[PDB]
Amino acid sequence: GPGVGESLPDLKIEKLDEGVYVHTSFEEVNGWGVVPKHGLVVLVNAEAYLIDTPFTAKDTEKLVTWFVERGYKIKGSISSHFHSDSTGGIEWLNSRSIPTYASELTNELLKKDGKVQATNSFSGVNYWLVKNKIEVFYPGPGHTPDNVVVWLPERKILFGGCFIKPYGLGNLGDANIEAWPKSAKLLKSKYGKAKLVVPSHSEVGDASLLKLTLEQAVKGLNESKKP
Amino acid sequence: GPGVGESLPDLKIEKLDEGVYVHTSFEEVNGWGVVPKHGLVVLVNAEAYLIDTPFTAKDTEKLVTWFVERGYKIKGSISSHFHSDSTGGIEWLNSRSIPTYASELTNELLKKDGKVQATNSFSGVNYWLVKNKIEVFYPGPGHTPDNVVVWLPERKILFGGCFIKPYGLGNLGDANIEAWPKSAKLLKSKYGKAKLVVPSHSEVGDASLLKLTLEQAVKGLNESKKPS
Ligand SMILES: O=C1CCc2cc(-c3csc(COc4ccccc4)n3)ccc2N1
Ligand SMILES: O=C1CCc2cc(-c3csc(COc4ccccc4)n3)ccc2N1
Ligand SMILES: [Zn+2]
Ligand SMILES: [Zn+2]
Ligand SMILES: [Zn+2]
Ligand SMILES: [Zn+2]
Numbered sequence: 001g002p003g004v005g006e007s008l009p010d011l012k013i014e015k016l017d018e019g020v021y022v023h024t025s026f027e028e029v030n031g032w033g034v035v036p037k038h039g040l041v042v043l044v045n046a047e048a049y050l051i052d053t054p055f056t057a058k059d060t061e062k063l064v065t066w067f068v069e070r071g072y073k074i075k076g077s078i079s080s081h082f083h084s085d086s087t088g089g090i091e092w093l094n095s096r097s098i099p100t101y102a103s104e105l106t107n108e109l110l111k112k113d114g115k116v117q118a119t120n121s122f123s124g125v126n127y128w129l130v131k132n133k134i135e136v137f138y139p140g141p142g143h144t145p146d147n148v149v150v151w152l153p154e155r156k157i158l159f160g161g162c163f164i165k166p167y168g169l170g171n172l173g174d175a176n177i178e179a180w181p182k183s184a185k186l187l188k189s190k191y192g193k194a195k196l197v198v199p200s201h202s203e204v205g206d207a208s209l210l211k212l213t214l215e216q217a218v219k220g221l222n223e224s225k226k227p
Numbered sequence: 228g229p230g231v232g233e234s235l236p237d238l239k240i241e242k243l244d245e246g247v248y249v250h251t252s253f254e255e256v257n258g259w260g261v262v263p264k265h266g267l268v269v270l271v272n273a274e275a276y277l278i279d280t281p282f283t284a285k286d287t288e289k290l291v292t293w294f295v296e297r298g299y300k301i302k303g304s305i306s307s308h309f310h311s312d313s314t315g316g317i318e319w320l321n322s323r324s325i326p327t328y329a330s331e332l333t334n335e336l337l338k339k340d341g342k343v344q345a346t347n348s349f350s351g352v353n354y355w356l357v358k359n360k361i362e363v364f365y366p367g368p369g370h371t372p373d374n375v376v377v378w379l380p381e382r383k384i385l386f387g388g389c390f391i392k393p394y395g396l397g398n399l400g401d402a403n404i405e406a407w408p409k410s411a412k413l414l415k416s417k418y419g420k421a422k423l424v425v426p427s428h429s430e431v432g433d434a435s436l437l438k439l440t441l442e443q444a445v446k447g448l449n450e451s452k453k454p455s
Contacts, residue, residue: 007395009394009395009443026394026395028259028260029260031236031263032430033262033263033394033428034394034429036393036394167423167431167432168430168431201430202432203432203433203436203439205433
């Protein structure tokens with residue numbers, strides 16, 4: 001809702017691996033309960049890259065302040081898809097002239113919704129946000145038409161965002177179930193020996209979260225072809 | 228409120244694993260929104276066991292018919308705590324002579340509250356609702372003094388009910404916040420190898436949710452303890 005959910009938990013920040021933190025923010029979402037949303041902060045040269053923003057400007061600000069107060073200035077943010085649990089902090093970041101990144105199709109979907117756009121876009125299937133350290137990849141449509149993943153080669157850590165859905169597919173409103181099985185299969189061959197997979201809405205796992213997502217996508221596609 | 232013609236999403240039933248269904252019902256919590264409630268239906272060869280009832284007689288009846296028309300006998304239900312979102316359809320199940328179960332303490336709380344009780348009580352820290360297949364465990368007070376969890380040793384699924392609160396404890400009006408940290412740690416140390424953990428009010432996860440609940444219990448205790 002437009003209002004502040006006064007009793008949600010606060011923004012969480014936790015170290016996942018050597019260069020890498022998980023940030024978790026929380027929102028009240030109709031029909032689901034409280035929903036957690038994980039993103040990352042990846043440090044490069046002791047400068048911070050946000051992988052997805054929190055739901056809100058308030059938690060984006062808290063996140064940024066925490067790292068900046070500790071000497072880690074913000075090099076940029078990248079959003080894995082257009083929904084506000086990935087993109088909600090883009091306007092705040094833009095107002096601080098922190099570069100924000102999104103695919104061309106993500107920015108088009110933001111605009112079509114009258115959302116503020118990232119100030120840096122990329123067309124096409126791979127994008128090195130930081131060569132050999134932060135890569136973006138488009139597996140095809142799934143949770144949404146634009147969803148991308150972020151790969152950290154040096155840690156073998158995959159940020160699957162809202163594409164990774166081990167225990168169920170979540171909000172299907174913008175989903176492409178026909179395509180999701182093919183996308184999930186593609187993603188699983190490519191990142192099969194990830195050490196760690198970070199879903200948006202489920203806590204971190206190993207590479208079996210790729211197989212679970214594929215099974216859930218196969219499952220939802222089947223059920224949808226009914227009564 | 229929602230309008231007079233507004234209905235909340237309809238009861239959902241979803242396969243979770245070979246023997247095992249999640250059932251999700253909804254109520255509106257006036258100005259927080261619409262909030263889901265998960266229970267299970269556990270299948271042991273053509274018998275079905277309800278793990279928690281929906282909030283309402285009407286959804287308890289929908290849930291029972293769904294399985295009766297797929298050929299199952301409803302052998303009984305068990306309620307994980309006394310709140311309506313676990314016991315709301317005991318009165319209806321009783322009216323159809325489906326055995327209903329709760330702990331001795333849960334039935335006492337129901338009777339205290341002027342509510343219909345389950346027809347069968349158990350008491351003790353472990354209780355087999357179905358030997359080798361459906362186990363009930365009391366971790367200690369937390370969400371409520373009487374909350375219990377259900378364990379399916381053969382799927383390694385834990386139904387944690389409203390005890391499992393990985394994103395925030397929820398309403399503490401009936402809770403024992405001083406006990407919840409200890410109870411949570413006992414629950415974690417017993418079921419740390421669960422393949423799945425099913426909370427009442429958030430989605431299915433893995434055994435991580437045990438750790439998250441402990442963290443939330445401890446932090447809730449701390450917050451309630453500051454002098455401001
Ligand atoms: O593999 C599967 C399919 C996905 C899935 C979902 C759940 C589950 C339990 S309550 C819940 C809440 O949902 C709804 C509440 C309101 C509107 C739409 C959905 N969702 C349990 C297990 C399964 N497991
Ligand atoms: O602004 C909004 C409200 C929040 C929101 C959520 C989603 C979305 C898509 S799949 C998904 C997964 O959810 C959950 C997964 C587990 C538990 C409860 C929810 N969640 C998409 C867009 C919106 N956008
Ligand atoms: Zn989304
Ligand atoms: Zn999402
Ligand atoms: Zn309760
Ligand atoms: Zn509850």
